[PDB]
PDB file of C-alpha atoms in Angstrom:
ATOM      1  CA  UNK A   8      82.842  93.971-140.621  1.00 57.57           C
ATOM      2  CA  UNK A   9      83.665  90.508-142.040  1.00 53.61           C
ATOM      3  CA  UNK A  10      86.794  89.572-143.933  1.00 55.11           C
ATOM      4  CA  UNK A  11      85.202  88.671-147.281  1.00 53.11           C
ATOM      5  CA  UNK A  12      88.511  87.642-148.866  1.00 52.21           C
ATOM      6  CA  UNK A  13      88.787  84.425-146.828  1.00 54.52           C
ATOM      7  CA  UNK A  14      86.092  81.726-146.826  1.00 55.67           C
ATOM      8  CA  UNK A  15      86.008  78.315-145.057  1.00 51.82           C
ATOM      9  CA  UNK A  16      86.998  75.246-147.083  1.00 53.06           C
ATOM     10  CA  UNK A  17      84.046  73.161-148.271  1.00 51.72           C
ATOM     11  CA  UNK A  18      83.971  69.896-146.316  1.00 50.90           C
ATOM     12  CA  UNK A  19      81.436  67.274-147.358  1.00 49.15           C
ATOM     13  CA  UNK A  20      79.940  64.952-144.747  1.00 49.15           C
ATOM     14  CA  UNK A  21      79.751  61.477-146.276  1.00 50.68           C
ATOM     15  CA  UNK A  22      77.723  59.778-145.004  1.00 54.34           C
ATOM     16  CA  UNK A  23      75.297  62.561-143.964  1.00 57.15           C
ATOM     17  CA  UNK A  24      75.125  63.392-140.260  1.00 55.82           C
ATOM     18  CA  UNK A  25      71.754  63.140-138.546  1.00 55.41           C
ATOM     19  CA  UNK A  26      71.451  64.999-135.243  1.00 54.53           C
ATOM     20  CA  UNK A  27      68.685  64.984-132.641  1.00 55.77           C
ATOM     21  CA  UNK A  28      67.961  68.185-130.705  1.00 54.08           C
ATOM     22  CA  UNK A  29      64.927  69.538-128.823  1.00 55.37           C
ATOM     23  CA  UNK A  30      62.767  72.647-128.954  1.00 55.87           C
ATOM     24  CA  UNK A  31      61.327  71.703-125.568  1.00 56.67           C
ATOM     25  CA  UNK A  32      61.772  68.968-122.987  1.00 54.14           C
ATOM     26  CA  UNK A  33      60.389  65.840-124.639  1.00 53.76           C
ATOM     27  CA  UNK A  34      59.959  67.533-128.021  1.00 56.07           C
ATOM     28  CA  UNK A  35      62.713  66.365-130.409  1.00 56.46           C
ATOM     29  CA  UNK A  36      63.443  67.435-133.954  1.00 55.45           C
ATOM     30  CA  UNK A  37      65.866  65.911-136.403  1.00 54.92           C
ATOM     31  CA  UNK A  38      68.369  67.697-138.620  1.00 54.75           C
ATOM     32  CA  UNK A  39      70.519  66.295-141.408  1.00 54.91           C
ATOM     33  CA  UNK A  40      73.888  67.777-142.340  1.00 54.93           C
ATOM     34  CA  UNK A  41      75.444  66.999-145.738  1.00 56.08           C
ATOM     35  CA  UNK A  42      78.364  69.405-145.277  1.00 52.51           C
ATOM     36  CA  UNK A  43      80.215  71.205-142.484  1.00 50.19           C
ATOM     37  CA  UNK A  44      78.440  74.546-141.859  1.00 51.81           C
ATOM     38  CA  UNK A  45      80.300  77.532-143.302  1.00 52.09           C
ATOM     39  CA  UNK A  46      78.478  80.414-141.632  1.00 49.18           C
ATOM     40  CA  UNK A  47      77.549  79.886-138.000  1.00 46.69           C
ATOM     41  CA  UNK A  48      75.581  82.190-135.729  1.00 44.49           C
ATOM     42  CA  UNK A  49      76.456  81.160-132.186  1.00 41.26           C
ATOM     43  CA  UNK A  50      74.546  82.429-129.157  1.00 40.97           C
ATOM     44  CA  UNK A  51      76.054  82.367-125.642  1.00 40.12           C
ATOM     45  CA  UNK A  52      79.384  81.152-124.245  1.00 41.28           C
ATOM     46  CA  UNK A  53      78.932  77.373-124.654  1.00 40.05           C
ATOM     47  CA  UNK A  54      78.043  77.763-128.338  1.00 40.33           C
ATOM     48  CA  UNK A  55      81.007  80.047-129.025  1.00 43.91           C
ATOM     49  CA  UNK A  56      83.813  78.419-127.039  1.00 37.55           C
ATOM     50  CA  UNK A  57      82.852  74.815-127.869  1.00 36.10           C
ATOM     51  CA  UNK A  58      83.057  75.440-131.608  1.00 37.70           C
ATOM     52  CA  UNK A  59      86.345  77.252-131.044  1.00 37.69           C
ATOM     53  CA  UNK A  60      87.639  74.325-128.956  1.00 38.26           C
ATOM     54  CA  UNK A  61      86.840  71.945-131.819  1.00 37.68           C
ATOM     55  CA  UNK A  62      89.052  74.017-134.123  1.00 40.28           C
ATOM     56  CA  UNK A  63      86.332  75.623-136.203  1.00 36.71           C
ATOM     57  CA  UNK A  64      86.323  79.198-134.895  1.00 38.41           C
ATOM     58  CA  UNK A  65      86.831  80.528-138.424  1.00 39.40           C
ATOM     59  CA  UNK A  66      83.367  79.274-139.371  1.00 38.73           C
ATOM     60  CA  UNK A  67      81.681  81.530-136.808  1.00 41.36           C
ATOM     61  CA  UNK A  68      80.172  84.682-138.328  1.00 41.22           C
ATOM     62  CA  UNK A  69      78.485  85.824-135.126  1.00 39.61           C
ATOM     63  CA  UNK A  70      79.435  84.863-131.576  1.00 39.94           C
ATOM     64  CA  UNK A  71      77.234  86.936-129.328  1.00 39.61           C
ATOM     65  CA  UNK A  72      76.685  87.058-125.578  1.00 39.32           C
ATOM     66  CA  UNK A  73      80.132  87.075-123.977  1.00 39.24           C
ATOM     67  CA  UNK A  74      80.697  90.441-122.230  1.00 39.82           C
ATOM     68  CA  UNK A  75      84.472  90.460-122.796  1.00 41.78           C
ATOM     69  CA  UNK A  76      87.402  88.414-124.153  1.00 39.88           C
ATOM     70  CA  UNK A  77      88.766  87.937-120.607  1.00 42.09           C
ATOM     71  CA  UNK A  78      85.875  85.554-119.901  1.00 39.90           C
ATOM     72  CA  UNK A  79      87.089  83.283-122.695  1.00 39.49           C
ATOM     73  CA  UNK A  80      89.773  80.662-121.903  1.00 39.39           C
ATOM     74  CA  UNK A  81      93.233  82.145-122.674  1.00 41.65           C
ATOM     75  CA  UNK A  82      93.953  79.587-125.435  1.00 42.17           C
ATOM     76  CA  UNK A  83      90.665  80.407-127.185  1.00 46.71           C
ATOM     77  CA  UNK A  84      90.987  84.206-127.031  1.00 46.22           C
ATOM     78  CA  UNK A  85      92.782  84.758-130.343  1.00 45.46           C
ATOM     79  CA  UNK A  86      90.100  82.879-132.283  1.00 44.48           C
ATOM     80  CA  UNK A  87      87.423  84.697-130.290  1.00 45.25           C
ATOM     81  CA  UNK A  88      88.878  88.065-131.323  1.00 44.05           C
ATOM     82  CA  UNK A  89      88.494  87.192-135.018  1.00 45.16           C
ATOM     83  CA  UNK A  90      84.716  86.707-134.821  1.00 46.41           C
ATOM     84  CA  UNK A  91      83.132  89.469-136.976  1.00 47.43           C
ATOM     85  CA  UNK A  92      79.906  90.019-134.965  1.00 45.40           C
ATOM     86  CA  UNK A  93      79.957  89.963-131.149  1.00 44.84           C
ATOM     87  CA  UNK A  94      77.643  92.752-129.955  1.00 43.57           C
ATOM     88  CA  UNK A  95      74.204  91.750-128.592  1.00 46.53           C
ATOM     89  CA  UNK A  96      72.619  94.572-130.589  1.00 45.54           C
ATOM     90  CA  UNK A  97      72.973  92.135-133.514  1.00 44.79           C
ATOM     91  CA  UNK A  98      70.993  89.435-131.697  1.00 45.48           C
ATOM     92  CA  UNK A  99      67.741  90.138-133.502  1.00 46.29           C
ATOM     93  CA  UNK A 100      66.030  88.472-136.425  1.00 43.55           C
ATOM     94  CA  UNK A 101      66.702  91.237-138.948  1.00 44.38           C
ATOM     95  CA  UNK A 102      70.493  91.297-138.357  1.00 44.49           C
ATOM     96  CA  UNK A 103      70.783  87.493-138.334  1.00 42.26           C
ATOM     97  CA  UNK A 104      68.830  87.241-141.612  1.00 40.52           C
ATOM     98  CA  UNK A 105      71.389  89.619-143.179  1.00 42.33           C
ATOM     99  CA  UNK A 106      74.218  87.339-142.033  1.00 44.30           C
ATOM    100  CA  UNK A 107      72.694  84.340-143.837  1.00 43.37           C
ATOM    101  CA  UNK A 108      73.767  81.609-141.426  1.00 43.89           C
ATOM    102  CA  UNK A 109      73.699  77.958-142.428  1.00 43.95           C
ATOM    103  CA  UNK A 110      73.791  76.862-138.781  1.00 40.10           C
ATOM    104  CA  UNK A 111      72.456  78.604-135.692  1.00 40.62           C
ATOM    105  CA  UNK A 112      73.523  77.278-132.294  1.00 39.82           C
ATOM    106  CA  UNK A 113      71.799  78.441-129.137  1.00 38.30           C
ATOM    107  CA  UNK A 114      69.405  77.807-126.291  1.00 36.51           C
ATOM    108  CA  UNK A 115      65.713  76.880-126.104  1.00 37.14           C
ATOM    109  CA  UNK A 116      64.761  80.563-125.745  1.00 36.44           C
ATOM    110  CA  UNK A 117      66.867  81.607-128.747  1.00 36.32           C
ATOM    111  CA  UNK A 118      64.620  80.002-131.350  1.00 33.60           C
ATOM    112  CA  UNK A 119      61.106  81.363-130.994  1.00 36.47           C
ATOM    113  CA  UNK A 120      59.335  84.197-132.814  1.00 34.74           C
ATOM    114  CA  UNK A 121      60.263  86.422-129.878  1.00 36.37           C
ATOM    115  CA  UNK A 122      63.913  85.959-130.886  1.00 34.73           C
ATOM    116  CA  UNK A 123      65.770  84.306-133.776  1.00 33.11           C
ATOM    117  CA  UNK A 124      62.857  82.127-134.992  1.00 28.73           C
ATOM    118  CA  UNK A 125      62.216  78.385-135.084  1.00 29.15           C
ATOM    119  CA  UNK A 126      64.106  75.422-136.650  1.00 29.01           C
ATOM    120  CA  UNK A 127      61.214  75.126-139.111  1.00 28.22           C
ATOM    121  CA  UNK A 128      61.720  78.744-140.178  1.00 28.95           C
ATOM    122  CA  UNK A 129      65.441  78.259-140.781  1.00 30.76           C
ATOM    123  CA  UNK A 130      65.038  74.889-142.476  1.00 30.86           C
ATOM    124  CA  UNK A 131      62.967  76.675-145.105  1.00 29.69           C
ATOM    125  CA  UNK A 132      65.974  78.959-145.593  1.00 27.16           C
ATOM    126  CA  UNK A 133      68.261  75.917-145.967  1.00 27.13           C
ATOM    127  CA  UNK A 134      69.874  76.402-142.558  1.00 25.35           C
ATOM    128  CA  UNK A 135      70.035  74.171-139.507  1.00 24.19           C
ATOM    129  CA  UNK A 136      69.427  74.858-135.819  1.00 22.97           C
ATOM    130  CA  UNK A 137      71.083  73.146-132.856  1.00 25.00           C
ATOM    131  CA  UNK A 138      69.775  73.705-129.333  1.00 24.69           C
ATOM    132  CA  UNK A 139      71.611  72.981-126.051  1.00 25.85           C
ATOM    133  CA  UNK A 140      69.692  70.247-124.227  1.00 25.50           C
ATOM    134  CA  UNK A 141      70.772  71.680-120.854  1.00 29.37           C
ATOM    135  CA  UNK A 142      68.920  74.914-121.675  1.00 30.83           C
ATOM    136  CA  UNK A 143      65.473  73.243-121.873  1.00 33.11           C
ATOM    137  CA  UNK A 144      64.467  74.071-118.302  1.00 33.48           C
ATOM    138  CA  UNK A 145      65.106  73.400-114.620  1.00 33.26           C
ATOM    139  CA  UNK A 146      62.249  70.884-114.268  1.00 32.59           C
ATOM    140  CA  UNK A 147      64.628  68.148-115.445  1.00 30.74           C
ATOM    141  CA  UNK A 148      67.903  67.287-113.708  1.00 30.01           C
ATOM    142  CA  UNK A 149      70.810  68.918-115.544  1.00 29.65           C
ATOM    143  CA  UNK A 150      73.789  66.589-115.942  1.00 29.16           C
ATOM    144  CA  UNK A 151      77.405  66.315-117.075  1.00 30.21           C
ATOM    145  CA  UNK A 152      76.152  63.788-119.636  1.00 36.14           C
ATOM    146  CA  UNK A 153      74.115  66.454-121.455  1.00 32.87           C
ATOM    147  CA  UNK A 154      77.293  68.523-121.836  1.00 35.14           C
ATOM    148  CA  UNK A 155      79.237  65.536-123.190  1.00 37.02           C
ATOM    149  CA  UNK A 156      76.569  64.827-125.816  1.00 36.60           C
ATOM    150  CA  UNK A 157      76.488  68.530-126.666  1.00 36.48           C
ATOM    151  CA  UNK A 158      80.209  68.472-127.397  1.00 37.15           C
ATOM    152  CA  UNK A 159      79.850  65.201-129.296  1.00 37.86           C
ATOM    153  CA  UNK A 160      76.978  66.542-131.451  1.00 35.18           C
ATOM    154  CA  UNK A 161      78.910  69.657-132.425  1.00 34.32           C
ATOM    155  CA  UNK A 162      81.867  67.377-133.148  1.00 34.34           C
ATOM    156  CA  UNK A 163      79.756  65.402-135.629  1.00 33.90           C
ATOM    157  CA  UNK A 164      78.359  68.565-137.234  1.00 33.21           C
ATOM    158  CA  UNK A 165      81.849  70.023-137.805  1.00 34.77           C
ATOM    159  CA  UNK A 166      83.598  66.765-138.686  1.00 34.60           C
ATOM    160  CA  UNK A 167      85.710  67.129-135.528  1.00 32.55           C
ATOM    161  CA  UNK A 168      84.917  63.789-133.932  1.00 31.28           C
ATOM    162  CA  UNK A 169      88.477  63.033-132.882  1.00 31.66           C
ATOM    163  CA  UNK A 170      88.803  66.443-131.211  1.00 32.96           C
ATOM    164  CA  UNK A 171      85.433  66.051-129.472  1.00 33.84           C
ATOM    165  CA  UNK A 172      86.311  62.614-128.100  1.00 32.29           C
ATOM    166  CA  UNK A 173      89.698  63.750-126.806  1.00 35.19           C
ATOM    167  CA  UNK A 174      88.089  66.689-124.981  1.00 35.20           C
ATOM    168  CA  UNK A 175      85.347  64.503-123.504  1.00 33.72           C
ATOM    169  CA  UNK A 176      87.805  61.785-122.480  1.00 33.44           C
ATOM    170  CA  UNK A 177      90.044  64.311-120.696  1.00 34.22           C
ATOM    171  CA  UNK A 178      87.095  65.360-118.546  1.00 36.45           C
ATOM    172  CA  UNK A 179      85.826  61.830-117.928  1.00 35.14           C
ATOM    173  CA  UNK A 180      89.274  60.492-117.016  1.00 35.21           C
ATOM    174  CA  UNK A 181      89.755  63.399-114.628  1.00 36.71           C
ATOM    175  CA  UNK A 182      86.505  62.734-112.745  1.00 37.40           C
ATOM    176  CA  UNK A 183      87.225  58.991-112.553  1.00 36.78           C
ATOM    177  CA  UNK A 184      90.799  59.537-111.416  1.00 37.46           C
ATOM    178  CA  UNK A 185      89.632  61.805-108.578  1.00 37.25           C
ATOM    179  CA  UNK A 186      87.010  59.341-107.329  1.00 38.04           C
ATOM    180  CA  UNK A 187      89.412  56.372-107.539  1.00 38.28           C
ATOM    181  CA  UNK A 188      92.263  58.051-105.631  1.00 39.94           C
ATOM    182  CA  UNK A 189      89.974  59.033-102.739  1.00 41.15           C
ATOM    183  CA  UNK A 190      87.542  56.107-102.418  1.00 41.45           C
ATOM    184  CA  UNK A 191      89.107  55.023 -99.112  1.00 41.66           C
ATOM    185  CA  UNK A 192      88.436  58.446 -97.567  1.00 43.61           C
ATOM    186  CA  UNK A 193      85.295  59.969 -96.043  1.00 43.32           C
ATOM    187  CA  UNK A 194      83.347  61.798 -98.794  1.00 44.06           C
ATOM    188  CA  UNK A 195      83.480  65.592 -98.342  1.00 46.39           C
ATOM    189  CA  UNK A 196      80.239  67.476 -97.650  1.00 44.55           C
ATOM    190  CA  UNK A 197      79.808  70.248-100.238  1.00 46.33           C
ATOM    191  CA  UNK A 198      77.546  73.289-100.548  1.00 43.99           C
ATOM    192  CA  UNK A 199      76.961  75.135-103.823  1.00 47.53           C
ATOM    193  CA  UNK A 200      75.400  78.577-103.516  1.00 50.51           C
ATOM    194  CA  UNK A 201      75.167  81.840-105.433  1.00 50.55           C
ATOM    195  CA  UNK A 202      74.975  85.070-103.468  1.00 55.44           C
ATOM    196  CA  UNK A 203      72.164  87.416-104.472  1.00 55.31           C
ATOM    197  CA  UNK A 204      71.932  90.399-102.169  1.00 54.20           C
ATOM    198  CA  UNK A 205      71.657  89.039 -98.646  1.00 53.77           C
ATOM    199  CA  UNK A 206      70.459  85.627 -99.802  1.00 52.05           C
ATOM    200  CA  UNK A 207      71.993  82.243-100.623  1.00 48.76           C
ATOM    201  CA  UNK A 208      70.579  80.919-103.880  1.00 51.26           C
ATOM    202  CA  UNK A 209      70.869  77.120-103.599  1.00 49.07           C
ATOM    203  CA  UNK A 210      72.171  74.761-106.298  1.00 53.10           C
ATOM    204  CA  UNK A 211      71.107  71.216-105.469  1.00 53.79           C
ATOM    205  CA  UNK A 212      71.014  67.729-106.927  1.00 53.97           C
ATOM    206  CA  UNK A 213      69.016  68.661-110.024  1.00 54.14           C
ATOM    207  CA  UNK A 214      71.577  71.292-111.086  1.00 53.41           C
ATOM    208  CA  UNK A 215      74.770  70.675-113.050  1.00 52.72           C
ATOM    209  CA  UNK A 216      76.885  72.028-110.177  1.00 54.25           C
ATOM    210  CA  UNK A 217      75.136  69.493-107.959  1.00 52.08           C
ATOM    211  CA  UNK A 218      75.760  66.734-110.498  1.00 51.01           C
ATOM    212  CA  UNK A 219      79.431  67.661-110.679  1.00 52.71           C
ATOM    213  CA  UNK A 220      79.634  67.300-106.902  1.00 56.62           C
ATOM    214  CA  UNK A 221      77.820  63.939-107.071  1.00 56.63           C
ATOM    215  CA  UNK A 222      79.931  62.712-110.007  1.00 56.03           C
ATOM    216  CA  UNK A 223      83.003  63.483-107.901  1.00 57.71           C
ATOM    217  CA  UNK A 224      81.558  61.338-105.084  1.00 58.38           C
ATOM    218  CA  UNK A 225      80.912  64.305-102.799  1.00 57.89           C
ATOM    219  CA  UNK A 226      78.048  64.503-100.333  1.00 56.18           C
ATOM    220  CA  UNK A 227      76.110  67.368-101.923  1.00 58.20           C
ATOM    221  CA  UNK A 228      73.876  69.399 -99.611  1.00 58.77           C
ATOM    222  CA  UNK A 229      70.332  70.007-100.879  1.00 58.01           C
ATOM    223  CA  UNK A 230      67.493  71.280 -98.697  1.00 59.29           C
ATOM    224  CA  UNK A 231      65.211  71.398-101.752  1.00 63.02           C
ATOM    225  CA  UNK A 232      64.434  75.110-101.482  1.00 63.94           C
ATOM    226  CA  UNK A 233      65.156  77.926-103.939  1.00 64.65           C
ATOM    227  CA  UNK A 234      67.136  79.447-101.063  1.00 65.50           C
ATOM    228  CA  UNK A 235      69.112  78.096 -98.114  1.00 66.33           C
ATOM    229  CA  UNK A 236      69.015  79.958 -94.808  1.00 65.00           C
ATOM    230  CA  UNK A 237      72.235  80.825 -92.994  1.00 66.03           C
ATOM    231  CA  UNK A 238      70.645  78.757 -90.224  1.00 66.54           C
ATOM    232  CA  UNK A 239      70.289  75.674 -92.439  1.00 64.63           C
ATOM    233  CA  UNK A 240      73.879  76.156 -93.570  1.00 63.02           C
ATOM    234  CA  UNK A 241      75.055  76.008 -89.944  1.00 64.28           C
ATOM    235  CA  UNK A 242      73.086  72.800 -89.392  1.00 63.67           C
ATOM    236  CA  UNK A 243      74.227  71.127 -92.622  1.00 64.13           C
ATOM    237  CA  UNK A 244      77.816  72.218 -91.942  1.00 66.30           C
ATOM    238  CA  UNK A 245      79.649  71.770 -95.272  1.00 65.00           C
ATOM    239  CA  UNK A 246      83.364  70.941 -95.383  1.00 64.88           C
ATOM    240  CA  UNK A 247      83.662  73.158 -98.471  1.00 66.88           C
ATOM    241  CA  UNK A 248      81.516  75.943 -99.934  1.00 65.88           C
ATOM    242  CA  UNK A 249      81.394  76.781-103.611  1.00 63.11           C
ATOM    243  CA  UNK A 250      80.365  80.363-104.325  1.00 66.55           C
ATOM    244  CA  UNK A 251      78.796  80.479-107.780  1.00 68.46           C
ATOM    245  CA  UNK A 252      79.271  83.820-109.551  1.00 66.99           C
ATOM    246  CA  UNK A 253      77.523  85.025-112.693  1.00 63.40           C
ATOM    247  CA  UNK A 254      79.280  87.087-115.301  1.00 62.76           C
ATOM    248  CA  UNK A 255      78.000  90.649-114.633  1.00 61.97           C
ATOM    249  CA  UNK A 256      78.764  90.114-110.964  1.00 61.56           C
ATOM    250  CA  UNK A 257      82.494  89.492-111.420  1.00 62.50           C
ATOM    251  CA  UNK A 258      83.086  93.126-110.429  1.00 68.43           C
ATOM    252  CA  UNK A 259      81.502  92.388-107.042  1.00 68.04           C
ATOM    253  CA  UNK A 260      83.659  89.298-106.392  1.00 65.70           C
ATOM    254  CA  UNK A 261      85.653  90.571-103.402  1.00 66.55           C
ATOM    255  CA  UNK A 262      82.519  92.077-101.852  1.00 67.99           C
ATOM    256  CA  UNK A 263      80.675  88.772-102.285  1.00 67.81           C
ATOM    257  CA  UNK A 264      83.487  86.755-100.704  1.00 68.33           C
ATOM    258  CA  UNK A 265      83.887  89.189 -97.844  1.00 70.63           C
ATOM    259  CA  UNK A 266      80.144  89.106 -97.142  1.00 71.00           C
ATOM    260  CA  UNK A 267      80.265  85.310 -96.859  1.00 68.45           C
ATOM    261  CA  UNK A 268      83.469  85.085 -94.802  1.00 67.40           C
ATOM    262  CA  UNK A 269      83.026  88.006 -92.403  1.00 67.24           C
ATOM    263  CA  UNK A 270      79.753  86.745 -90.975  1.00 68.26           C
ATOM    264  CA  UNK A 271      78.491  85.797 -87.525  1.00 66.42           C
ATOM    265  CA  UNK A 272      76.317  82.702 -87.745  1.00 67.16           C
ATOM    266  CA  UNK A 273      78.596  81.241 -90.393  1.00 68.79           C
ATOM    267  CA  UNK A 274      81.855  81.504 -88.424  1.00 68.28           C
ATOM    268  CA  UNK A 275      81.341  78.105 -86.782  1.00 70.41           C
ATOM    269  CA  UNK A 276      80.917  76.283 -90.094  1.00 69.95           C
ATOM    270  CA  UNK A 277      83.805  73.949 -91.003  1.00 70.95           C
ATOM    271  CA  UNK A 278      84.265  75.400 -94.491  1.00 74.08           C
ATOM    272  CA  UNK A 279      84.787  78.834 -92.923  1.00 76.15           C
ATOM    273  CA  UNK A 280      87.053  77.628 -90.086  1.00 75.15           C
ATOM    274  CA  UNK A 281      89.270  75.831 -92.587  1.00 73.03           C
ATOM    275  CA  UNK A 282      89.116  78.483 -95.305  1.00 74.53           C
ATOM    276  CA  UNK A 283      87.483  76.198 -97.851  1.00 72.76           C
ATOM    277  CA  UNK A 284      85.285  78.708 -99.648  1.00 73.87           C
ATOM    278  CA  UNK A 285      85.987  79.011-103.354  1.00 72.69           C
ATOM    279  CA  UNK A 286      84.647  80.919-106.347  1.00 73.32           C
ATOM    280  CA  UNK A 287      82.951  78.863-109.060  1.00 74.34           C
ATOM    281  CA  UNK A 288      82.065  80.669-112.307  1.00 76.20           C
ATOM    282  CA  UNK A 289      78.458  80.221-113.435  1.00 77.10           C
ATOM    283  CA  UNK A 290      79.694  79.995-117.034  1.00 75.62           C
ATOM    284  CA  UNK A 291      81.399  76.731-116.020  1.00 76.86           C
ATOM    285  CA  UNK A 292      78.401  75.135-114.292  1.00 76.30           C
ATOM    286  CA  UNK A 293      75.358  76.305-116.226  1.00 77.19           C
ATOM    287  CA  UNK A 294      75.154  75.005-119.835  1.00 77.34           C
ATOM    288  CA  UNK A 295      78.934  75.417-120.009  1.00 80.42           C
ATOM    289  CA  UNK A 296      79.762  73.240-123.006  1.00 80.95           C
ATOM    290  CA  UNK A 297      83.556  72.917-123.207  1.00 82.56           C
ATOM    291  CA  UNK A 298      83.934  75.122-120.080  1.00 81.23           C
ATOM    292  CA  UNK A 299      82.758  72.171-117.979  1.00 80.77           C
ATOM    293  CA  UNK A 300      86.510  71.466-117.716  1.00 79.98           C
ATOM    294  CA  UNK A 301      86.947  74.599-115.569  1.00 79.60           C
ATOM    295  CA  UNK A 302      84.268  73.515-113.090  1.00 79.43           C
ATOM    296  CA  UNK A 303      85.560  69.930-112.896  1.00 77.02           C
ATOM    297  CA  UNK A 304      88.963  71.347-111.920  1.00 77.12           C
ATOM    298  CA  UNK A 305      87.627  73.831-109.374  1.00 78.32           C
ATOM    299  CA  UNK A 306      85.253  71.355-107.753  1.00 79.82           C
ATOM    300  CA  UNK A 307      87.671  68.397-107.668  1.00 79.59           C
ATOM    301  CA  UNK A 308      90.485  70.616-106.361  1.00 79.72           C
ATOM    302  CA  UNK A 309      88.202  72.144-103.718  1.00 78.07           C
ATOM    303  CA  UNK A 310      86.683  68.806-102.694  1.00 79.51           C
ATOM    304  CA  UNK A 311      90.012  67.006-102.400  1.00 81.19           C
ATOM    305  CA  UNK A 312      92.806  69.445-101.318  1.00 80.23           C
ATOM    306  CA  UNK A 313      95.077  66.561-100.319  1.00 79.95           C
ATOM    307  CA  UNK A 314      94.939  65.016-103.784  1.00 81.74           C
ATOM    308  CA  UNK A 315      95.460  68.423-105.409  1.00 80.39           C
ATOM    309  CA  UNK A 316      97.980  70.258-103.157  1.00 79.55           C
ATOM    310  CA  UNK A 317      98.593  72.832-105.884  1.00 79.30           C
ATOM    311  CA  UNK A 318      95.395  74.621-104.890  1.00 76.84           C
ATOM    312  CA  UNK A 319      92.043  75.631-106.334  1.00 77.57           C
ATOM    313  CA  UNK A 320      92.170  77.643-109.601  1.00 75.90           C
ATOM    314  CA  UNK A 321      91.022  81.309-109.589  1.00 73.69           C
ATOM    315  CA  UNK A 322      88.858  82.879-112.291  1.00 73.43           C
ATOM    316  CA  UNK A 323      88.909  86.707-112.252  1.00 72.63           C
TER     317      UNK A 323
END
């Protein structure tokens, strides 16, 4: 399965890197790294693609949870393909023990006795654990800031600080550019929803998608309900609708879009009249790590079509 004839170069971290992460909201733990990890088990898209984006894809032994290479950014696909273990049937404690990771990167739910075990467990095996802060739960507002720190932390762990800062700066400069070029204009009114059956799952101010809208100076709609009625959508009347789509539901994309467009109550809504309804991949707006760049582009391009005449990017 692995290529055992090629092993990552030993890179010492002097001085040692101390990182703060959390097992739960408000429950921090500290980890100290004296060397760049050589054998990483990475759970879910943000873990996998962020480490790849930093240039350290070769250090990943397992990168599990992406359904297919097509979901990975084109420029990261080659590195993705080299990862020895990808199949979720390896995402169990017994298989991960066999792999002998020295760093495990995942979500809050990844590191309990129901799954891959706690930081305390792994620290006794001389490994470290890093947990995405944006995976700690919906009770706290999820922000772009959490994603930046996430990228920055991984940058410190892998001695890729320069690469991390460049990536972060690209995103920050992009947001700030957009807001500055349009400050004299009326802020667009945006709606972020995911379609689940015949219902509109709402993403409001406490979600990252909401925060991306707010960061970009949009007027983000939020009725503070797990769902928004077609009736409330008519009243709120967004200039632009973002349709959030999860990964398994890519195959239903055209059916989703057609359900939203070819409606009755919705036909009067500005976003529909002016054909401003765009797909927004969940993987870019829910603990996305490096893929936050994709959502910034889609949202800024959809919010401000006059600033970005080239159009809103498509993802499958």
